[PDB]
Design an enzyme around this catalytic site. Structure first.
Site, PDB file in Angstrom:
ATOM      1  N   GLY J  29      20.527 -68.342 135.200  1.00  0.00           N
ATOM      2  CA  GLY J  29      20.461 -67.240 133.988  1.00  0.00           C
ATOM      3  C   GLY J  29      21.980 -66.719 133.946  1.00  0.00           C
ATOM      4  N   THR J  30      22.036 -65.855 133.035  1.00  0.00           N
ATOM      5  CA  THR J  30      23.387 -65.166 133.021  1.00  0.00           C
ATOM      6  C   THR J  30      23.800 -63.894 133.926  1.00  0.00           C
ATOM      7  OG1 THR J  30      22.334 -63.733 131.188  1.00  0.00           O
ATOM      8  CG2 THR J  30      23.537 -65.960 130.376  1.00  0.00           C
ATOM      9  N   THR J  31      25.048 -63.788 134.231  1.00  0.00           N
ATOM     10  CA  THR J  31      25.548 -62.858 134.972  1.00  0.00           C
ATOM     11  C   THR J  31      24.831 -61.388 134.638  1.00  0.00           C
ATOM     12  OG1 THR J  31      27.438 -64.055 135.105  1.00  0.00           O
ATOM     13  CG2 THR J  31      27.304 -61.868 136.439  1.00  0.00           C
ATOM     14  N   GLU J  46      26.008 -59.955 130.596  1.00  0.00           N
ATOM     15  CA  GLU J  46      26.754 -60.886 129.990  1.00  0.00           C
ATOM     16  C   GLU J  46      25.656 -61.555 128.980  1.00  0.00           C
ATOM     17  OE1 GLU J  46      29.663 -63.910 132.154  1.00  0.00           O
ATOM     18  OE2 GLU J  46      27.892 -65.171 131.562  1.00  0.00           O
ATOM     19  N   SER J  74      17.445 -61.498 134.797  1.00  0.00           N
ATOM     20  CA  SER J  74      18.080 -62.887 134.526  1.00  0.00           C
ATOM     21  C   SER J  74      17.060 -64.044 134.979  1.00  0.00           C
ATOM     22  CB  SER J  74      19.563 -63.034 135.233  1.00  0.00           C
ATOM     23  OG  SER J  74      20.462 -62.248 134.662  1.00  0.00           O
TER      24      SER J  74
END
Ligand SMILES: Nc1ncnc2c1ncn2[C@@H]1O[C@H](COP(=O)(O)OP(=O)(O)OP(=O)(O)O)[C@@H](O)[C@H]1O
Ligand SMILES: Nc1ncnc2c1ncn2[C@@H]1O[C@H](COP(=O)(O)OP(=O)(O)OP(=O)(O)O)[C@@H](O)[C@H]1O
Ligand SMILES: [Mg+2]
Lengths: 133, 86, 240, 54, 242, 108, 233, 66, 241, 243
Positions: J29-31, J46, J74
């Site tokens: 996943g994204t930060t 993010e 995330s």
């Protein structure tokens, strides 16, 4: 050892490689990806028109009358491999030798299709192995 | 494996040899460090030293040590399970 | 619950639990049906290998569903009783709500519909039984003779046979039964059904059972003496 | 052994890092670990750290 | 072992795909739709001479304005035809008007997918889908005569003429050449009987072949054996006229 | 090595294989760079927009992306064209995939 | 070629992915192309239908959901026939109880959470259809893309199905022209037909093969067909 | 020593025959056509299917031809 | 194959899957010690907070079930909270249907029986925590019962659990070997804590700051854990001896 | 061998492989970061801009629960959107029965049981999501992070997604310089600085920054979005330093 000479640490010589298996299920992901097995080609059960051409390639040596409608007995044969079709023609020629007739007739080919698919639908390799595919 | 007590002696043997700007974070690092073998602490000072090459520093900051500890730990734990003694 | 999908298609396009069910009906004892001018005759194979077995109290192969519909069967003896319970039930249910006994074709459509149901219900194995449902509709004398099977499809026949050695019996019935002219009477028809059986039973007067069902609710079972007489005649007729 | 001698460098064809597509961060991290302690061996000796072994 | 819901690596439900081959094993159903009616032709395919061929049934009335033909494992179709008469009947009870053909077909397609292993109270009433395909013919005032092919895929197309069964491949080759919008009801009958003869594996006679039409005036009618004998005699004539 | 879970802990661990470098699948942008260094060797055109082809391939290895380039030329050769066109790169992505039934109008 | 983690949805792979949800996403790449795009006053669906063969008719592709919301499928028909029926009911459940036209954005999430609960549990085929859901509420025009994973997103324009990429490329260039065409429903349909002609593999547009649907500030959801789309080819 | 089960014996005019020929036969027969484009020809083929479908039959057919 | 995933016997005659649960216990590196006072019970356990980022207060292994019953858990913390929440519900329900407070024994015996049903059903997995309940029951005095995933439990004069439990067992035994009584005797509950910490410094070798320990004490009719200030007082009392 | 195929089975070691696998699905996943300030919490995520068709500022991946518990996750985006949805029942239900807004250590407990339950049968897949959720009640601010295993802890800064290495290293320096407990008004500008630094290993596909805060003293303990000017100032602050 085999995997490591199909990518080397060098270009290997002109070498084509053909693999023939009854199960791709078994094979390791390292063998399968392109660069070691570029093109997968499936040899599958022939459809209806296939089974018409494969009857013509076994029978052309055989003596058969003119009134054999190969479309009629291909339609009557269910989903079959090309290995059953050999046994079909062999058995058509077989019933003609038992009957004391030199030429195979329409009656004889129907009997043979009946005998091959009836009994050996109990012993069809096709059903188990199609599932591993 | 070194205990929480010893683990502290081992750090001080591999950070003395190497240059540093004076490092007071071994009180934090030891507590972060679980299941570290002797071998991983010695590698930890090296990874800290490799962040010192990228920044163009010539001393191991106490910030570079906080990063190195975490980096050795993430990969270690994941990829190998060390034996259970009898 | 327990609802595993026991019955599924194979890639060849046959259900393997249904082909397996139909092989089970092959090992079964043999039951034959032939309809004369105005009777039906159901002939059945009694396993006589057994000795010291009382015949007075032992369940027969012909079980009356109503007073004018009889049912015979091949296959697993245990599972067969399960169809016959739902059938006796269905015959009184239809008498209750519409009045008038069941017509043979309707009683089959129910029984055939049960065998079909157990090929979709998850958790249930198919039945191992094929039946011959015979009898006379109420207020009529057209004989009717039907066959169901564990696929669930049912068909009427002029003569039929299920169970072991059925190809040999069926071949004899394709030569000895004229489709236009039935056995003249009730007595000729019995003589056609016994003569078919004696090919695959390899004789034994005790082995063969004959039940005749006639119009107007007349069910009678031919006794041992009668059967013996017929066999001796045919043997002596054929012998001569 | 004669097999060791066949294993030596016979020259592997010039790939160049331009013909390894993508993968920037991986290239960096390898050349940090293998390349530098050979050529830039004086900057590790002054820092005091040992050289990564593999 | 695979479940019954599983997708293949292509994105096709195994059972639903396999099911299509069960239809190929079935007997031949032909359907030609004209502007005067639809003709339904079937090969009964008796299996013995003792088998009485009149009791076999492959054409059935749904309502006076919808008829149905079956190909495949036909005992499954006992369950589909029962649902259809209820939807068609229950729908004439609530709204005092005969269903459309297009709406009736869709109700039997929704029913088709219902296979599963069970979850909560929800019915799943098969282990594998209906192993039968149907040619639903019928007529409403809104869109004249229609002819539909409902497959266990769960999708139905409206067809000008389709043929399913053992001789499906070779049968639909002949239709593609012979059909046009200007066939009448008596030419389609001889056109079904001509195609039924090319893919048939027996002799063509009155006992083992059946015809059916659907007209507005007379409803859905299955021809007796007597009428079918006249049309069989009338085929041999047009082929000897040439 | 491609199985790292299997090797026992004396072969791994810092002080032996200090760095443990992971290789990720080419990301959607890298696919664009990759397809472009293998195509230089064979004939190209300006028809091709590599940006398109890079978005299509999902979870393709840097080995399969090299296959796409090769396979696409095979189809250019079978027609008999001077050079590779955009159709054949699209058509080639489908040949690397083991797809072999297409849409038998199984899908609406 | 069939993996070892292809059994039920419960299984995770050692890579981390869920394979059965990925297989259902291939069911979209074999359906027929369909293109959606919106301005700030009109949403438009342009779908290329698919016949089975010559004698056959064409397969519906655009479902009127209400009078201000409609969706187009690409993939399995019976999977959509459950998800389109479910949105209908959820749009009535808002007009009845709260007397509120169901906002397009909220209908996406409702659909999403209905797809999720079938990949959590054992048994339950994942839904093998990709929808585009257009609609016009109080916040303007909206166009959603719904994957069978369940993830719903808000876009100025997309496409799905076979060889969609050729159309999705034409929308990335012209995005800055067609987004500003407001209060003019004719030109916005023109830009959508041109998009889907880039995806054809020489099937050729025809008056019986094309289906358009629009919805706007003033129009109800309406589908054009047969003779009505002769002006727009 | 290369047996002979001629190529006629392979059933039909399948695509499957033509995909084998592009891998084995063509780069040995005619390397003129591959030189212009600059494509380096594929190398690996995987024949797979239920028993009795003629996986081996083709192998023998390309054994003499090649 | 399918005799070692689910809970059926193996051909040998042993519930493998249960046996695998006990190896899941020592996967947190907590050690604990628990001794019976003369009118109280004291249980100390190490509390390692790994990262600087974690907030040191939330990390805890000592759970208040009731006024009467404390509970110290050895093992993975998801299953901790799952067994502590089920314990609290049974503690309340008992009070409601019988009208007095749940004794220590009766809470221990209810957990062993839920634990048993979990090794006899097929689809359930046994919870991987070992639970130790301390209390000052009113009928039997100071008590300790230690329960485990198999569903076996027994009384204890004193007990330890963890990776280095063997070292701690030898000390707890050596003490009852010399004095020849079942329980540490000292009326005050403050000096049973001082004794407790002494035996941990020996058995583990580790010197303890005030943050590395988390202390729980059951007296009459209240169970508390000591504040971070109070654990610093105790450690000045060890230094001054 | 066969111990990896199924859930709620143990290997001879003592591990649930399905649960170990789920952490690898969180890892893609994204930060996503969470900063506990003195007075409350600041969530910041993010959100990758995949293409020029995705509409700007319209796909919020921050979901609110009640009026004072922010949730940002995330991993598998649908699967998170289900774990929150179940969490809106647990909160609305507590509030019905005890007529007080649910306290944060209790909400952490409800979610915990729900995720822990999904590692107990063969019949359900473990959740593939890491959550960061917190807010402000009458006992102060709390911050929690929920592993897909079912554990949760207190935190003073948390991270998940691909950028969890660089983030967690940066949140250490943020608690070093500001041991008093930095101000809520300032921590908006510090959270921005931790996303732009953790987006240098991902600088390929540009992004759009989302921030939300819940402070006792700024917004009255009600969870809002940062929008308008204070957000456009945050982008400026982080962007000027990392030049
Ligand atoms: N990132 C990349 N950029 C460009 N080309 C690549 C890339 N990755 C792979 N290739 C191409 O794929 C070919 C095969 O790759 P390679 O043999 O390294 O696979 P591998 O990862 O070593 O597999 P194994 O698991 O057997 O070690 C290379 O010769 C190269 O041309
Ligand atoms: N496509 C075909 N055309 C003509 N004859 C065929 C075809 N396929 C099979 N046969 C016949 O079947 C026989 C057996 O086939 P073959 O030995 O190739 O089996 P196979 O495909 O290798 O499967 P397996 O390896 O499982 O036996 C052949 O010798 C041939 O006579
Ligand atoms: Mg072979």
């Amino acid at each position: 050892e085999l995997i490591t000479q199909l990518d080397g640490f060098d270009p290997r010589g002109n070498i084509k490689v053909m693999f023939a298996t009854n199960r791709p299920n078994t094979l390791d992901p390292a063998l399968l990806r392109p660069g070691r097995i570029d093109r997968k080609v499936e040899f599958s059960l022939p459809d209806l028109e296939g089974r018409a051409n494969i009857f013509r390639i076994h029978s052309k040596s055989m003596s058969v009358e003119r009134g054999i409608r190969w479309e009629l007995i291909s339609r009557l044969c269910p989903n079959s491999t090309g290995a059953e079709l050999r046994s079909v023609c062999t058995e058509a020629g077989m019933f003609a030798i038992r009957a004391r007739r030199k030429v195979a007739t329409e009656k004889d080919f129907l009997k043979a299709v009946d005998k091959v698919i009836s009994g050996y639908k109990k012993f069809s390799s096709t059903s188990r192995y199609m599932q591993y595919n | 494996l070194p205990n929480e007590a010893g683990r502290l002696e081992i750090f001080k043997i591999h950070t003395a040899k190497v240059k540093k700007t004076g490092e007071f974070d071994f009180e934090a690092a030891v507590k972060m460090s679980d299941g570290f073998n002797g071998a991983d602490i010695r590698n930890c000072a090296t990874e800290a030293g490799f962040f010192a090459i990228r920044d163009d520093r010539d001393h191991i900051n106490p910030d570079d040590l906080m990063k190195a500890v975490r980096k050795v730990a993430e990969v270690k734990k994941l990829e190998g399970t060390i034996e259970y003694q009898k | 619950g327990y609802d595993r999908a026991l019955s599924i298609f194979s890639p060849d396009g046959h259900i393997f639990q249904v082909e397996y069910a139909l092989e089970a009906v092959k090992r079964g004892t043999c039951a034959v049906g032939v309809k004369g001018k105005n009777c039906v005759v159901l002939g059945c194979e009694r396993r006589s290998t057994l000795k010291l077995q009382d015949t007075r109290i032992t369940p027969s192969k012909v079980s009356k569903i109503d007073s004018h519909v009889v049912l015979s069967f091949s296959g697993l003896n245990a599972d067969s009783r399960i169809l016959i319970e739902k059938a006796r039930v269905e015959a009184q249910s239809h008498r209750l709500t519409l009045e008038d006994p069941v017509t043979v074709e309707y009683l089959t459509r129910y029984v055939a519909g049960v065998q079909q149901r157990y090929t979709q219900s998850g958790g249930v194995r198919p039945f191992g039984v094929s039946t011959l449902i015979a009898g006379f509709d109420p207020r009529d004398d057209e004989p009717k003779l039907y066959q169901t099977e564990p696929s669930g499809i049912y068909s009427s026949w002029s003569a039929q046979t299920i169970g072991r050695n059925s190809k040999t019996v069926r071949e004899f019935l394709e030569k000895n039964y004229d489709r236009k002219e039935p056995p003249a009477t009730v007595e000729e028809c019995v003589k056609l059904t016994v003569r078919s059986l004696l090919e695959v039973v390899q004789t034994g007067a005790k082995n063969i059972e004959i039940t005749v069902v006639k119009p107007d609710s007349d069910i009678v079972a031919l006794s041992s003496e009668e059967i013996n007489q017929y066999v001796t005649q045919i043997e002596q007729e054929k012998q001569e | 052994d004669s097999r060791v001698k066949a294993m030596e460098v016979d020259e592997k064809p010039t790939e160049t890092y331009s013909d390894v597509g993508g993968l920037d961060k991986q290239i960096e991290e390898l050349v940090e670990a293998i390349v530098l302690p050979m050529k830039r061996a004086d900057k590790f000796k002054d820092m005091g750290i040992r050289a990564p072994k593999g | 072992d695979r479940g019954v819901s599983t997708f293949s690596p292509e994105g096709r439900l195994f059972q639903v795909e396999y099911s299509l081959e069960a239809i190929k094993l079935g007997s031949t159903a032909i359907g030609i739709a004209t502007k005067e009616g639809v003709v339904l032709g079937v090969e009964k395919r008796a299996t013995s001479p003792l088998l009485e061929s009149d009791s076999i049934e492959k054409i059935v009335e749904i309502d006076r304005h919808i008829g149905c033909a079956m190909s495949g494992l036909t005992a499954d179709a006992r369950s589909m035809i029962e649902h259809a008469r209820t939807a068609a009947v229950t729908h004439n009870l609530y709204y005092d008007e005969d269903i459309n053909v297009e709406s009736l077909t869709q109700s039997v397609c929704d029913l088709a997918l219902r296979f599963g292993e069970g979850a909560s109270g929800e019915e799943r009433l098969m282990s594998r889908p209906f192993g039968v395909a149907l040619l639903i013919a019928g007529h409403d005032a809104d869109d004249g005569y229609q002819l539909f092919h409902a497959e266990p895929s769960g999708t139905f197309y409206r067809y000008n003429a389709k043929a399913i069964g053992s001789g499906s491949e070779g049968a639909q080759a002949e239709l593609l050449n012979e059909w046009h919008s200007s066939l009448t009801l008596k030419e389609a009958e001889l056109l079904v009987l001509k195609i039924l003869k090319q893919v048939m594996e027996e002799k063509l006679d009155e006992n083992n072949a059946q015809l059916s039409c659907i007209t507005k005036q007379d409803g859905f009618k299955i021809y007796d054996n007597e009428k079918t004998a006249e049309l069989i005699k009338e085929l041999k004539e047009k082929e000897a006229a040439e | 090595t491609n199985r790292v879970d299997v090797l026992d802990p004396a072969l791994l661990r810092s002080g032996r294989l200090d760095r443990k470098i992971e290789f990720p699948l080419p990301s959607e942008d890298s696919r664009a760079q990759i397809l472009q260094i293998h195509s230089r060797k064979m004939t190209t055109d300006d028809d091709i927009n590599w940006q398109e082809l890079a978005r299509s391939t999902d979870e393709f290895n840097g080995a399969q992306l090299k296959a796409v380039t090769v396979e696409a030329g095979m189809i250019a050769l079978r027609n008999g064209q001077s050079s590779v066109k955009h159709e054949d790169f699209v058509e080639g992505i489908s040949e690397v995939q083991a797809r072999k039934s297409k849409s038998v109008s199984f899908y609406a | 070629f069939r993996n070892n983690y292809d059994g039920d949805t419960v299984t995770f792979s050692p890579t981390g992915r869920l394979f059965q949800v990925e297989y259902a996403l291939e069911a979209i790449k074999q359906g027929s192309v369909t293109v959606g795009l919106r301005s700030n006053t009109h949403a438009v669906l342009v779908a290329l239908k698919r016949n089975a063969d010559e004698l056959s008719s064409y397969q519906k592709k655009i479902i009127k959901c209400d009078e201000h919301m409609g969706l187009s499928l690409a993939g399995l028909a019976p999977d959509a026939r459950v998800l389109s029926n479910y949105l209908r009911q959820q749009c009535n459940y808002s007009s009845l109880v709260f007397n509120r036209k169901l906002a397009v954005e909220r209908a996406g999430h409702l659909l999403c959470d209905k797809a999720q609960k079938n990949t959590q549990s054992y048994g339950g085929r994942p839904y093998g259809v990709g929808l585009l859901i257009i609609g016009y509420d109080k916040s303007g025009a909206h166009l959603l893309e719904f994957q069978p994973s369940g993830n719903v997103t808000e876009l100025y324009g997309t496409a799905i199905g076979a060889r969609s990429q050729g159309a999705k490329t034409y929308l990335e260039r012209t995005l800055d022209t067609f987004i500003k065409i407001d209060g003019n429903p004719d030109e916005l349909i023109k830009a959508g037909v041109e998009a889907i002609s880039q995806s054809l593999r020489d099937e050729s547009l025809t008056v019986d093969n094309l289906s358009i649907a629009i919805v706007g500030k003033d129009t109800p959801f309406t589908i054009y067909d047969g003779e009505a789309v002769a002006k727009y080819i | 020593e290369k047996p002979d089960v001629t190529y006629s014996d392979v059933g039909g005019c399948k695509d499957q025959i033509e995909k084998l020929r592009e891998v084995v036969e063509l780069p040995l027969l005619s390397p003129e056509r591959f030189a212009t484009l600059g494509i380096d020809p594929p190398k690996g083929i995987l024949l797979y299917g239920p028993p009795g479908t003629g996986k081996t039959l083709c192998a023998r057919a390309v054994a003499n031809r090649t | 194959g399918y005799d070692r995933h689910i809970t059926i016997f193996s051909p040998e005659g042993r519930l493998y899957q249960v046996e695998y649960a006990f190896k899941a216990t020592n996967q947190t590196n907590i050690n604990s010690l628990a001794v019976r006072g003369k009118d109280c019970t004291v249980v100390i356990s190490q509390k390692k907070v790994p990262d600087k980022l974690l907030d040191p207060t939330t990390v805890s292994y000592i759970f208040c079930i009731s006024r009467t019953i404390g509970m110290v858990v050895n093992g993975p913390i998801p299953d901790a909270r799952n067994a502590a929440l089920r314990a609290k519900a049974e503690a309340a329900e008992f009070r409601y249907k019988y009208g007095y407070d749940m004794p220590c024994d009766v809470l221990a015996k209810r957990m062993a029986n839920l634990s048993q049903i979990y090794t006899q059903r097929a689809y359930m997995r046994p919870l991987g925590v070992i639970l130790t309940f301390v209390s000052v029951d009113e009928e039997l005095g100071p008590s300790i019962y230690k329960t485990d995933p198999a569903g076996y439990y027994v009384g204890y004069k004193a007990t330890a659990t963890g990776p280095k439990q063997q070292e701690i067992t030898t000390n707890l035994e050596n003490h009852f070997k010399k004095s020849k009584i079942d329980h540490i005797n000292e009326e005050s509950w403050e000096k049973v804590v001082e004794f407790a910490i002494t035996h941990m410094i020996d058995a583990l070798g580790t010197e303890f700051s005030k943050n590395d320990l988390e202390v729980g004490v059951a007296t009459k009719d209240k169970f508390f854990t000591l504040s971070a200030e109070n654990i610093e007082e105790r450690l000045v009392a060890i230094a001054e001896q | 061998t066969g111990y990896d195929l199924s859930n709620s089975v143990f290997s001879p070691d003592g591990r649930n492989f399905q649960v170990e696998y789920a952490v690898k699905a969180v890892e893609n996943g994204t930060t996503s970061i969470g900063i506990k300030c003195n007075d409350g919490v600041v969530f910041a995520v993010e959100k990758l801009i995949t293409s020029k068709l995705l509409v700007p500022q319209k796909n919020v991946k921050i979901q609110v629960v009640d009026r004072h518990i922010g949730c940002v996750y995330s991993g598998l985006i649908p699967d998170g959107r289900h774990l929150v949805n179940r969490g809106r029942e647990e909160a609305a239900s507590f509030k019905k029965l005890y007529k007080t807004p649910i306290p944060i250590p209790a909400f952490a407990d409800r979610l915990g049981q729900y995720v822990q339950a999904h590692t107990l049968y063969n019949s359900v897949r473990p959740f593939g999501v890491s959550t960061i959720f917190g807010g402000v009640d009458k006992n102060g601010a709390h911050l929690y992070m929920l592993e897909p295993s079912g554990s949760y802890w207190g935190y003073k800064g948390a991270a998940t997604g691909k950028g969890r290495q660089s983030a967690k290293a940066e949140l250490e320096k943020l608690v070093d310089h500001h041991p008093e407990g930095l101000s809520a008004r300032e921590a908006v500008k510090q959270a921005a600085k931790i996303i732009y630094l953790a987006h240098e290993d991902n600088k390929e596909k540009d992004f759009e920054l989302e921030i939300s805060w819940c402070s006792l003293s700024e917004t009255n303990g009600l969870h809002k979005f940062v929008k308008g000017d204070l957000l456009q100032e945050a982008i400026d602050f982080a962007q000027k330093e990392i030049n």
